[PDB]
Design an enzyme around this catalytic site. Structure first.
Site, PDB file in Angstrom:
ATOM      1  N   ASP A 100       0.900  -1.127   0.000  1.00  0.00           N
ATOM      2  CA  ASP A 100       0.000   0.000   0.000  1.00  0.00           C
ATOM      3  C   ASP A 100       0.949   1.189   0.000  1.00  0.00           C
ATOM      4  O   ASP A 100       0.961   1.903  -0.998  1.00  0.00           O
ATOM      5  CB  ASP A 100      -0.890  -0.054   1.261  1.00  0.00           C
TER       6      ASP A 100
ATOM      7  N   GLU B 263       8.753  19.465  -2.565  1.00  0.00           N
ATOM      8  CA  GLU B 263       8.753  18.597  -3.694  1.00  0.00           C
ATOM      9  C   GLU B 263       7.317  18.070  -3.760  1.00  0.00           C
ATOM     10  O   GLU B 263       6.666  18.359  -4.750  1.00  0.00           O
ATOM     11  CB  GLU B 263       9.836  17.591  -3.388  1.00  0.00           C
ATOM     12  N   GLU B 264       6.756  17.424  -2.738  1.00  0.00           N
ATOM     13  CA  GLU B 264       5.379  16.892  -2.738  1.00  0.00           C
ATOM     14  C   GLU B 264       4.197  17.794  -3.117  1.00  0.00           C
ATOM     15  O   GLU B 264       3.336  17.433  -3.929  1.00  0.00           O
ATOM     16  CB  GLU B 264       4.965  16.306  -1.363  1.00  0.00           C
TER      17      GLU B 264
ATOM     18  N   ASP C  79       8.496  10.194   4.215  1.00  0.00           N
ATOM     19  CA  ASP C  79       8.727  11.483   3.607  1.00  0.00           C
ATOM     20  C   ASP C  79       7.458  12.338   3.557  1.00  0.00           C
ATOM     21  O   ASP C  79       7.617  13.544   3.785  1.00  0.00           O
ATOM     22  CB  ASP C  79       9.305  11.270   2.208  1.00  0.00           C
TER      23      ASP C  79
ATOM     24  N   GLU D  96      16.233  21.256  -4.855  1.00  0.00           N
ATOM     25  CA  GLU D  96      17.535  20.649  -5.028  1.00  0.00           C
ATOM     26  C   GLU D  96      18.693  21.535  -5.529  1.00  0.00           C
ATOM     27  O   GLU D  96      19.543  21.939  -4.720  1.00  0.00           O
ATOM     28  CB  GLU D  96      17.312  19.470  -5.928  1.00  0.00           C
TER      29      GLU D  96
ATOM     30  N   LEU E  62      12.944  15.093   2.202  1.00  0.00           N
ATOM     31  CA  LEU E  62      13.723  13.868   2.452  1.00  0.00           C
ATOM     32  C   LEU E  62      14.265  13.337   1.134  1.00  0.00           C
ATOM     33  O   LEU E  62      13.700  12.408   0.545  1.00  0.00           O
ATOM     34  CB  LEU E  62      12.833  12.799   3.165  1.00  0.00           C
ATOM     35  N   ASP E  63      15.347  13.962   0.639  1.00  0.00           N
ATOM     36  CA  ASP E  63      16.066  13.522  -0.573  1.00  0.00           C
ATOM     37  C   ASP E  63      16.550  12.127  -0.254  1.00  0.00           C
ATOM     38  O   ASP E  63      17.059  11.931   0.850  1.00  0.00           O
ATOM     39  CB  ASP E  63      17.313  14.401  -0.901  1.00  0.00           C
TER      40      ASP E  63
ATOM     41  N   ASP F 188      13.415  20.485   0.245  1.00  0.00           N
ATOM     42  CA  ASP F 188      13.134  19.127  -0.132  1.00  0.00           C
ATOM     43  C   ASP F 188      13.224  18.433   1.196  1.00  0.00           C
ATOM     44  O   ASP F 188      14.307  18.333   1.776  1.00  0.00           O
ATOM     45  CB  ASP F 188      14.165  18.520  -1.033  1.00  0.00           C
TER      46      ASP F 188
END
Ligand SMILES: O=P(O)(O)OC[C@H]1O[C@@](CO)(OP(=O)(O)O)[C@@H](O)[C@@H]1O
Ligand SMILES: O=P(O)(O)OC[C@H]1O[C@@](CO)(OP(=O)(O)O)[C@@H](O)[C@@H]1O
Ligand SMILES: O=P(O)(O)OC[C@H]1O[C@@](CO)(OP(=O)(O)O)[C@@H](O)[C@@H]1O
Ligand SMILES: O=P(O)(O)OC[C@H]1O[C@@](CO)(OP(=O)(O)O)[C@@H](O)[C@@H]1O
Lengths: 316, 316, 316, 316
Positions: free
Chosen positions: C49, C78-79, C55, C261, C101-102, C99
């Site tokens: 799932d 990012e999200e 993150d 980034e 959690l790269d 960002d």
């Protein structure tokens, strides 16, 4: 960095070797400590069925941790109505009585708590492996407590003496801090809940009066009473003084249970040079009748307890 | 809270029971872990004789931690010029070869490091208890590594398989996370220092070209190379790919030492279903000559290594 | 027990008192440190799932802390699709790009990962604030990254230059580890994914040739690619070298986004005497059209980025 | 991994943005939290010529952090003789009174100990600042204490009332545990050293009689004295009760100092609906003549402090 890093296992293992052992003691105490690290942590951020819960959580972490060492066989807790017999495949030679979290529901005020324990050995062919193997406290082979205060200490008493190990929280290991300790002969402090007890005390009453306004050339005893048996007894090991809880109502007096509060504590005290008395009876030599029986206790510096007995002799 | 709390000892102990053991394995790994918790912590705030120091500190914490378990007898490290024979009173049946901090001086750039280890057993009457008891890697009984990255993992391989335990830093215990793991048959990634090696590689050269611009219906291999054997091999266990370090100059090629880098790693890989080859020689079956000898290694997913061998067969 | 620790918070404040007014940066960064801490312990236990999860909870975390330092107005993830605009009673002067959690997509192999963040100052007035205030280039006030590796390292790139902090795991703080870092003029390492880039690589191909195959007696450059940007940029900030992302079939040939980034990293490398070019322009000078705008980043020790660009002049 | 933690810092800021200007309290308290953290881990490991020491290093610590929040001007310790006056370029508007380690003299028994602190606002202008600005009474801006016990609890007593924070040992923060605590109107416990006070006790003697011996059918008050002020005041803030220090042969019969010990506690009890009397006046209203001015403190649940004072009216 400490590299002759004396951990508990390190210690407990080289003592076993001398006894021409089998391992179970070490496996056991190893198991005991993992419950203690997890309990220390449960407490260290506590306040972040329902109401009671913590003592329970701990009870069930000490039972399950002790069963997995193939070292125990009968286990007794405050929490369980009657003994638990370890299943045949996981049995070993040892009997453990313990109080998983003495003080438990009184930790909101951040008072120092503890798990207290006594270890016996089954000497019988079989009964099978029964509760009746609950016998006098001078038969204990190991006894001690884990204190949860400013720092976490596992004070441990065995045939050879009393030793103090502190949890290093940076390596999750109990390291030997204070070694082969003895208690001060006599010392400036006495501990007793001086409320109620005062309306209900025996010859205590006079010893207390005597320690407040002394007669012979003195200076008064400082009083201190935390309200956790582990907090008030450990200080008593550390400074030297006297601790007593006899309180008369309930006559199997006390409140503190014999098998798991009184006999570990007494064993420690005696092994470090104090004496622990019922006043009339001497506590480690009382032979039990119930796993959950209650006993009066007075413990600490030799001289000071001798003092309460000499009062008690020429009284009732 | 986890209360069927599978710690390493818990695990290692119930496996010993089945083997009709004596304890030394468990005492040993217990000792091994305390060096690993203290090393994990040394690293986790590192940068807070002189220049080298950390690998050393660790070396001396693993030797002293392994001597105290009455389980070892010959010990071999990158750091020590020749084997150390455990003194008669503290001896036991096991031989441990280990690299205390692979990657060591390259941790300023916070790269994931590790301690790698292989465990043998002395099978001989006596020699007394000598270094010559350094024999082929398929005789290992236990092997594995402790990784020090985002989190700390003790990946451990024994006769029954490969298991993954992670340090819970809140109870200083290694708890069973991933169980009885196998490696992916083949997988999208290859690892080799693609600088220098390219001017000096064998049939590697072609396998690399083949993995970059593939011929048959494909999509290219992703490349990744951390520069710590523990970091690049553990990923390889975790995703599936191939790892290789043969680099031709030094012809006892390699750089990675056989007894303590190559044979633990290979043992793990094989126990989880990968294969590890010298290309021409198969690494765990090479029999050693020196405790400090060097070996070429290629390790990972079965199919992918099979691929490099089939290239290597119809070449030199 | 060593009495004067230079917390990030002290340092920022002492450089900043020497500016003053509503220079909110300190309660901004101070709140940044609480989520970065929070993440670190999460990641050091994710294992003890869902195609994505730790993150998106980091995302949630960062947003909340950013907002409660009454220091912010437009946030960029990012999200989250859109730039998130802070609400009136919590508004302060800055725009922050991050960002959370790269590498969250490589946790399983315990690679090394981090939080990238770039702060901006909301310039054009009472817009209220929605994206104009967010799309500068080289106008970053301060930027930098959290590396969660062996230990958690917070590098802050400010106006005054670059310094590094370490999470003192024991006291809960980012203590000053290096005070004014500057890069090696030319390094000895090149970081690029030569797998599915080698065939698609443009001019950069001559460049990698000349880094492996040395056209003189020069010793070849060592390959090094961890495959997590926080990990390869920081290693390149300390051992020098070139790091590159010229992706071709990720067609503004970079996977890497500018606001979160590329831009924080180019502002760190540049404030430490290193170059970051798009290869045509300087990455710091590109103008943002959309928030999640991908781009190429070549960044490294100066004389190496130059050695590639003069190839690039020649080339195209 | 639970995304919105109410750090002391957030809370102080959100009550305080709703005031604003140079309300420096937040970087002041924020710096207070870093030394209190630092102390806690020190004390949780002190065990793993000196008649005094961990406490003079705490002293040093607190001073340094206080000063670097460019928030302070006159500091007050138990150890340092004179009020310490901050130097120009680090000056801000507040005066802070603190006892760095109450009970450092009982660590050995692992009692429970803490940091007491009282903040003041420098009022009269450019004195520069030296002791006038430090000697108010009931004028405390915010005060409170750090209890290092089972866990570290920071109680902050502000203008708005009393709240408690807990050190989340895992993320490095004081998270909000109770939001607006108020005391039990009458408690059931009395805290006093009945040893070397019983004979020297004044009016207070009738009071203890009526707390032990109940003049009705009322159930007697339970004794409780841990002997570390942080410990007895905080327990009295949660289970109610009376706490007292009427020392006689410590002759402004109190050992306890006003600026650091008594005053922070009376400001907490009062902002939580409890009383603190000198027994003649209200402790909060006494005027300071010297910094290290001893005094008596009776503090507790309201209707009990009253029950004692009406005795005291009667009495003397
Ligand atoms: O507070 P009182 O009731 O006087 O008793 C204190 C004693 O009670 C103990 C155990 O005897 O706790 P508890 O009420 O939970 O049983 C200890 O905390 C301590 O030794
Ligand atoms: O960087 P190079 O020299 O290519 O080698 C990487 C390899 O070297 C190793 C061991 O073989 O470290 P080291 O240089 O310290 O000996 C590992 O980090 C890794 O497997
Ligand atoms: O492996 P490729 O796709 O070539 O790119 C590596 C880059 O991707 C990153 C983000 O840039 O992660 P991800 O695959 O999750 O998108 C980093 O790990 C790294 O900088
Ligand atoms: O034991 P006495 O001297 O009566 O007073 C107790 C008080 O002394 C304190 C300070 O007030 O410590 P200390 O003996 O070190 O001076 C606290 O522990 C406590 O509040």
């Amino acid at each position: 960095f400490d590299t002759n890093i004396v951990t508990l296992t390190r210690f407990v293992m080289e003592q076993g070797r001398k006894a021409r052992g089998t391992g179970e003691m070490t496996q056991l105490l190893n198991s005991l400590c993992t419950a203690v690290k997890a309990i220390s942590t449960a407490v260290r951020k506590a306040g972040i069925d329902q109401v009671k819960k913590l003592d329970v959580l701990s009870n069930d972490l000490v039972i399950n941790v002790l069963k997995s060492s193939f070292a125990t066989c009968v286990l007794v807790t405050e929490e369980d109505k009657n003994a638990i017999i370890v299943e045949p495949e996981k049995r070993g030679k040892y009997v453990v009585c313990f109080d998983p979290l003495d003080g438990s529901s009184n930790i909101d005020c951040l008072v120092s708590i503890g798990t207290i324990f006594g270890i016996y050995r089954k000497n019988s062919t079989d009964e099978p492996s029964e509760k009746d193997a609950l016998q006098p406290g001078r038969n204990l082979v190991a006894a001690g407590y884990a204190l949860y205060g400013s720092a976490t200490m596992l004070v441990l008493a065995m045939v050879n003496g009393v030793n103090c190990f502190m949890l290093d929280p940076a390596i999750g290991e109990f390291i030997l801090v204070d070694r082969n300790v003895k208690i001060k002969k006599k010392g400036s402090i006495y501990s007793i809940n001086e409320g109620y007890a005062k309306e209900f005390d025996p010859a205590i009453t006079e010893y207390i009066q005597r320690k407040k306004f002394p007669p012979d050339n003195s200076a008064p005893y400082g009083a201190r009473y935390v309200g956790s048996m582990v907090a008030d007894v450990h200080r008593t090991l550390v400074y030297g003084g006297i601790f007593m809880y006899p309180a008369n109502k309930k006559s199997p007096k006390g409140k503190l249970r014999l098998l798991y509060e009184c006999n570990p504590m007494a064993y420690v005290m005696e092994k470090a040079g104090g004496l622990a008395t019922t006043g009339k009876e001497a506590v480690l030599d009382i032979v039990p009748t119930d796993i959950h029986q209650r006993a009066p206790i007075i413990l600490g510096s030799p001289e000071d307890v001798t003092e309460l007995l000499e009062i008690y002799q020429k009284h009732a």
